């Protein structure tokens, strides 16, 4: 059975433009602006939106997921350890027990980002891709939002002004580059912020410092995921993501306590 | 609650390599190999796997979704017309009615790919990203599989041999480039296959020729989505995706009839 | 034992220049000039030099080996089927029997090129790397040598004249690109030579046409390895190399009969 | 005589994947991980494997050999001085006496890497090419392994997690870049390691400091070859390789004494 | 002797602009416009200017000389056979007799372009570098000049209009690319001009067809040097330049007869 | 009259290789090695060779001349002031008086490099193009030569060892980059050499400091031309070259006094 389909150019374009502009008018003021659509950023966004907060996750690339897609050296699987596996189970991700290691679970590296993103959207978080955060909005002794630019404009090297998103809290979940905190420190030397970068690999120590390092680095700016270890010179952990998920959830919980919600 | 996490380097690497190995040993022989992880490819894979077939969706880029992510000219929304809207609802995608056009629905362009991919995986389809199909496996008067290469190896220009995936049917769901059918035609001139490419834009005619053009172009090779209009010189339709979803579902139904008769 | 080493700059440079000079004066006239330092080219060179012929193997890249190094899709192993396995054993390559397929042997993809090249050198063949063959030397109704250029000069796009190597026979062992035969055909339209290129993958038919296709395409110019299937529109076979080795050995045997009759 | 060859796609792919995964499962834990497949790295690997140690040589490029291939300024010959010429003789490399200088020997720059690599493989060392070491595994006051990434993934700029290789000792044989020691020093400022880089050319002094500079720079991390002079600000020696070979052999001997084997 | 030098910015800039302006006003109408500052172009320009004609040599690159500089494969020497050696001696170039080949002379590949250019300038020819000829000026059944563009503008890809140079005769001395004749043929299909390109290498036949091929291909457009063999499908000859010099001199003699009859 | 020309491939290649190797054997030991084939380097080479010294000028690009070719902002003329105009007159360069300024002369920017290079060659200096000086040869408290690499090898990024040229004195005439002195200072921090770079433009002061700044910066290493002002933080002078020529001649005179010749 082949259906006669209703299609045109004018109403499709008009519908897309109307929805996109209504969307933009609503996103320019949020409770939390999460920079980076990776495992920790998608987790923080889900747990904040889950509680009724107005949240936007900003991802530079056209698609979200960060460094999960490729797994380990291209082998498409990632490891999660207890109790962080419960966060992936909550997103409907299929997990298998690693035989020689109690507490280790393995998941398809392509299934994880897709389901974590879908779960954040279902919790009420807005995910905007192809949007690069190039700077922050400042106020006296605090961060008050982010400065966004189109990824294509940035990549094409065009000299164009950005637009802004006002937020009560900003989360730097940009990975080992800690690009948001690094930009804040580089452009505002008077603040005395230093981003030493991650140390070499030591999974045991790297995973067990992420939660301690997930905190407010400057008023209004939180750091989570690998960016937390990059800002506090913590070790790397490899293709094990338990700490990334727990770091994102802790970040949400810390901001919820500050907003009393 | 303080979390003492179990983490190391050796067992994480071993677990990833073992799972990836077991996966590769299973995926080298499938019932259907779908080339392209776009809207039509993800739909065809879901409806084929839903019926118990062994299916693999091969996507060149690190993430799937194809041309959905960006919406229309960067505006992050896409249109779907009835009855294709039901396919998106089956994947749990949130749809809004377009004001003034009965039959039109609009969806967040970032939510669609994430949920379509998650739905295909839940139906039992395997999605492999970062894998480029560079050629086909031939037999007397038929296609019998695909020749795959790592996307990074291809992009880096390294001279490396590929590996193969045997399949009863191959689906070219690579979009307007119809790369699979074009490669078959270019390397095997004796077959007399021609890929004229898509015509200019005419949404009404473009959308209503996709189902008619979704067919077996060469024994063992089916074409669906925008690749069907590229192979049969059909018009383009823009950011309206109803035909892409229905074309993928029709493709699955056509292959299911062949394999169950 | 403490080592007091004799070292300077002048005598090291002088020794290198003298040896390179003496080498170039000898290599400008050879019996056979093999273009391509891949599996078939290295085999043809070994079996020709083994019989006392003056042979030179010209490779574009800094190192030889061609497409063997990477194995299959980066997995560092390659397959060889009997009786071609004997050619690899003659070079001292370690082979393992494939479980479940009688006649199949597997070898480390890094060990093969190193040992095939060392075996060709020990047989008396000269291997020159970083040398690109950009054209052929012609005579009435025959090829009489090759036109060589430095790979760095070619890559840098510098406008520099090449030098030449006179040869009784030239072997195009450049792989699927069949660059030597393609250049001959493109620059000399009057000869009526056509290079259709390889067909799609079909290992069974592809491997069993290589020997038939290993022949003299134009007087003085032989084709072997994957270039033979590219010139005669044969199928591809993937990471199985038995035919490549046997094609190189057959090429050497065919030229030896011509030069000893 | 043309043989009917047994060939297919499925069993070739399956055999390659099985061998590659059995290989990867074995390489993730070694006695020594040598970074760099150049003259000193290939020598150190040969002399360690020769004594029964489990060794892996990791090379970034598709082929090993480092800076030997090109000889001096493209002239394809390299010089070796006594007693280092015995190391090349042990690999079966053909040497000629330099006439004006007693103690100097010259060799074909293409024959050296091929035979040094074949000799290391025959001694029992595993050589993995197309593998970039991007970081180290650390423990309290020591290096405990390497962090590896696919060269194509690294070159393609893909954001993908690496995998690891546990080792009792790591050898930085990456040449004048001393990339392993430089990464350790750059990412772990708390260790106080400095990599000044090589000084200008002075063959006499450069060659006679290599052995003194071949040592353990940090517990578990040895440096050899030009990397030894780069880490200790030693002079360059040019296309004379005696010190590179003796440095690699000394490195092996020093590690064998520490492992008591 | 201490030197007190007179220097400023204003008068230096003013002097350069005034001279360049006066120069451009004079060069926009010439008797002959030679395209290409290579061996044949520099020779044709010298012999035309020597007879009192107003001549301009237009070279795309910042410096003239073409493919002489690099000699053969980077070896900085070029061969000239009698009687063309006399043309180089007339320019003051030092020549050495080739041992064992009577009639062959060898010259420093860096000395040749410098002296040929200086000789053309001393004969009265104007050489303009960094000027690309992108098209021709046409009239009924004839070429009447050239369309010039700045090489930097062309290289930078800027969309800028060119300027023109009116000439009684134009010489295509652009080498094997025969860019001027190829542009004329490509943009004016109605003229029926074909540029097959050079054939493979055959020095004996290639050198002995250059003079025969040095002729008027279209009224007002002459072809000389390697461009003459490219337009008439002649063979290549390598690093022997006798024919290039004699072809340039013949071209000048042919144009002089036309302009004095 | 068209002559029957003697031409072949073998003897042309043999003649070029023989001359190039005889040349290389002679150039590896010189009295002075001049780095940079610009106005000051070509002048210094001419005046040193004029006195019977064995001199080699090494230029990175395929052609010499440096920044003279383009004149001022592409306007093809350069200014020379008294008494430096006599140096250009000695090379046979045609000069015109600048009308408003007594002491200023203007010359064709294309005629200058060609004639300065031809004059240096006629004085007995050897000019090698396409040769990059990447480092220096050191001895106790002195520079003893240069480390050379092929420009194409350097540009192509190939990992290849260089060769050397022993010299009593080295001249850094590389322009405002002062690449030779900068490399010496960067690689040998123990020497305490600093290269601040040129200051902004001030022709009067820039031209009148060049001679004072033309001196021996480190034993065996002289600096001349703009490199002299770059090493001593002198001002720029623009398209006026009087100081460049006088600086090169002074450099020659200073070295002749040290060599007592
Ligand atoms: N300035 C920016 N604006 C917007 N997005 C940005 C910006 N900078 C980075 N991003 C984007 O943020 C995302 C961060 O995802 P990413 O996956 O890098 O960070 P993560 O959530 O902490 O997880 C890190 C692990 O993948 C890995 O490091 C590991 O060791 C395993 O545990 C990536 O997808 C970037 O494209
Ligand atoms: N050789 C290949 N191997 C693997 N993947 C491939 C190959 N060639 C293409 N792909 C991948 O296939 C996917 C194709 O997805 P794509 O979204 O382009 O195709 P589609 O499912 O038919 O939908 C088309 C619409 O987006 C759009 O065209 C439209 O409606 C306007 O008229 C993209 O994600 C490619 O990266
Ligand atoms: N013009 C040239 N001059 C010099 N070298 C050249 C030129 N063109 C190519 N080469 C060099 O020639 C070598 C060819 O080696 P290559 O390995 O590609 O050819 P082969 O010996 O027939 O073996 C082919 C298989 O690897 C593979 O195709 C297969 O089995 C799948 O069907 C490569 O190393 C090139 O760099
Ligand atoms: N991070 C990395 N991971 C893996 N491989 C690497 C990495 N960094 C470098 N390599 C690879 O390591 C290899 C080092 O080989 P290389 O030849 O550079 O080092 P070497 O053994 O000390 O010998 C140095 C001489 O060639 C030369 O400098 C000289 O003066 C003559 O004596 C090269 O082939 C690199 O590609
Ligand atoms: N459209 C253009 N406008 C201006 N200059 C141009 C244009 N196209 C080419 N040129 C310039 O013209 C010059 C041509 O010099 P070229 O040296 O290439 O031509 P030639 O004078 O005939 O001598 C050819 C030999 O070098 C060589 O081919 C040989 O003997 C082997 O068979 C080169 O310097 C180009 O940059
Ligand atoms: N490492 C190197 N090896 C070889 N050649 C080199 C190297 N570095 C630079 N060169 C080459 O050296 C040449 C230097 O020529 P350059 O013209 O730059 O130096 P110069 O003789 O002092 O004259 C400077 C003026 O052109 C200009 O600055 C000015 O203000 C007017 O007076 C240039 O042609 C480079 O390509
Ligand atoms: Na298969
Ligand atoms: Na004009
Ligand atoms: Na020759
Ligand atoms: Tb119908
Ligand atoms: Tb508000
Ligand atoms: Tb709600
Ligand atoms: Tb527990
Ligand atoms: Tb345990
Ligand atoms: Tb328990
Ligand atoms: Tb507040
Ligand atoms: Tb980064
Ligand atoms: Tb940094
Ligand atoms: Tb602790
Ligand atoms: Tb609390
Ligand atoms: Tb089966
Ligand atoms: Tb459903
Ligand atoms: Tb309507
Ligand atoms: Tb309605
Ligand atoms: Tb379930
Ligand atoms: Tb069937
Ligand atoms: Tb495309
Ligand atoms: Tb119709
Ligand atoms: Tb039906
Ligand atoms: Tb002969
Ligand atoms: Tb044998
Ligand atoms: Tb069977
Ligand atoms: Tb058996
Ligand atoms: Tb022997
Ligand atoms: Tb014959
Ligand atoms: Tb190719
Ligand atoms: Tb048949
Ligand atoms: Tb026979
Ligand atoms: Tb037969
Ligand atoms: Tb163990
Ligand atoms: Tb053993
Ligand atoms: Tb001794
Ligand atoms: Tb001595
Ligand atoms: Tb002795
Ligand atoms: Tb211990
Ligand atoms: Tb480097
Ligand atoms: Tb550095
Ligand atoms: Tb000492
Ligand atoms: Tb001891
Ligand atoms: Tb007029
Ligand atoms: Tb004369
Ligand atoms: Tb003769
Ligand atoms: Tb004679
Ligand atoms: Tb005069
Ligand atoms: Tb007329
Ligand atoms: Tb060209
Ligand atoms: Tb004839
Ligand atoms: Tb006549
Ligand atoms: Tb005649
Ligand atoms: Tb001496
Ligand atoms: Tb003299
Ligand atoms: Tb005066
Ligand atoms: Tb004044
Ligand atoms: Tb006066
Ligand atoms: Tb002295
Ligand atoms: Tb510079
Ligand atoms: Tb600087
Ligand atoms: Tb003063
Ligand atoms: Tb004095």
């Amino acid at each position: 059975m082949d259906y006669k389909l209703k299609a045109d150019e004018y109403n499709v374009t008009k519908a897309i433009l109307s929805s996109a502009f209504k969307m933009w008018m609503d996103v320019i003021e949020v409770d939390v602006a999460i920079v980076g659509g990776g495992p920790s950023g998608l987790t923080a966004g889900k747990y904040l939106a889950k509680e009724g907060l107005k949240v936007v996750i900003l991802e530079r690339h056209l698609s979200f997921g960060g460094g999960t897609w490729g797994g380990g050296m291209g082998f498409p699987y990632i490891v999660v350890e207890e109790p962080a596996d419960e966060i992936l189970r909550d997103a409907g991700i299929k997990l298998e027990k690693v035989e020689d290691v109690e507490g280790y679970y393995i998941a398809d590296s392509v299934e994880v980002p897709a389901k974590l993103g879908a779960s954040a959207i279902d919790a009420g978080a807005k995910i905007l891709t192809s949007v690069a955060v190039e700077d922050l909005i400042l106020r006296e002794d605090k961060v008050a939002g982010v400065v966004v630019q189109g990824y294509a404009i940035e990549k094409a090297g065009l000299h164009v002004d950005p637009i802004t998103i006002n937020a009560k809290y900003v989360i730097d979940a940009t990975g080992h580059d800690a690009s948001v905190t690094t930009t804040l420190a580089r452009k505002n030397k008077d603040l005395g912020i230093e981003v030493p970068g991650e140390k070499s690999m030591w999974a045991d120590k790297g995973e067990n410092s992420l939660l301690r390092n997930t905190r407010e680095v400057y008023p209004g700016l939180f750091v989570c995921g690998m960016a937390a270890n990059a800002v506090h010179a913590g070790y790397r952990m490899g293709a094990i993501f338990g700490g990334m998920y727990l770091s994102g959830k802790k970040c949400a919980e810390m901001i919820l306590e500050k907003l009393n919600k």
Side-chain angles (χ1 to χ4, degrees), chain A residues 15-219:
Chain A
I16 290 170
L17 290 165
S18 302
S19 292
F21 281 110
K22 263 64 183 183
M23 185 278 293
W24 274 110
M25 297 275 92
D26 193 54
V27 82
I28 47 171
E29 182 178 44
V30 293
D31 291 318
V32 187
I34 300 151
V35 189
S40 70
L42 295 171
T43 301
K46 172 185 181 173
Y47 288 87
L48 284 159
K50 196 180 168 184
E51 302 302 313
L53 290 180
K54 191 175 178 183
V55 170
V56 65
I57 301 159
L58 308 154
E59 172 57 50
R60 201 201 294 280
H61 295 123
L62 250 182
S63 70
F64 56 68
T68 57
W69 301 101
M73 207 195 195
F75 297 110
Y77 284 93
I78 59 100
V79 176
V80 67
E81 76 270 48
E82 61 100 28
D85 61 300
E86 291 147 46
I87 291 164
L88 295 199
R89 279 177 213 284
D90 196 44
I93 294 153
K94 180 168 60 272
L95 297 176
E96 276 227 313
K97 284 186 79 66
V98 171
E99 38 281 282
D100 298 331
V101 193
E102 268 293 333
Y104 274 19
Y105 295 88
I106 194 129
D108 181 332
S109 71
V110 168
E111 183 180 356
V112 175
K115 295 193 177 175
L116 284 185
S119 209
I121 290 165
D122 286 342
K126 179 67 183 192
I127 303 176
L128 289 184
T129 66
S130 207
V131 175
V133 165
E134 60 159 78
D135 211 347
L136 293 149
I137 295 170
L138 296 184
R139 281 308 181 268
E140 196 197 357
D141 300 315
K142 80 178 187 204
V143 160
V146 295
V147 179
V148 297
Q149 181 56 275
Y151 166 65
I153 287 160
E154 199 184 59
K155 201 180 151 178
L158 303 182
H159 175 24
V160 174
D161 268 299
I163 58 172
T164 55
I165 295 172
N166 292 86
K168 290 167 185 66
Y169 284 98
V170 174
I171 299 180
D172 180 357
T174 62
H176 72 276
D177 282 337
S179 71
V180 174
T181 309
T182 300
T183 295
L184 179 65
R186 175 184 106 252
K187 302 190 82 166
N188 309 267
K189 298 290 210 291
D190 54 304
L191 304 184
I193 296 156
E194 298 161 332
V195 179
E198 72 198 359
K199 290 225 281 277
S200 277
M201 173 109 47
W202 193 345
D204 183 32
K205 289 215 149 25
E207 275 285 89
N208 287 294
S209 61
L210 282 169
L211 297 176
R212 170 207 322 161
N213 294 342
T214 298
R215 54 181 220 97
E216 204 174 4
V217 301
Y218 187 73

